[PDB]
Amino acid sequence: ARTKQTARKSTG
Amino acid sequence: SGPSCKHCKDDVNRLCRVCACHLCGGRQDPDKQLMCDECDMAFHIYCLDPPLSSVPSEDEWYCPECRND
Ligand SMILES: [Zn+2]
Ligand SMILES: [Zn+2]
Ligand SMILES: [Zn+2]
Secondary structure (H helix, E strand, O other): OOOOOOOOOOOO | OOOOOOOOOOOOOOOOOOOOOOOOOOOOOHHHOOEOOOOOOEOOHHHHOOOOOOOHHHOOOOOHHHHOO
């Protein structure tokens, strides 16, 4: 389906 | 409704609820992000880390509300 791992993203 | 966020560029400094966690929108094991293709909603399965520890991406998956159609 749509796993969409999502790339790392943070205020870091 | 395309997957692209017309309201979020997914900046690295800022996290987007639509592209990230809606319940907390934070970074936590993002690789294990589960989302129902029919909806841009995901599950705290990666945040809570429940016994499910399973990914239904193998086939199309619908969120519990989708089936409540
Ligand atoms: Zn977004
Ligand atoms: Zn969360
Ligand atoms: Zn759905």
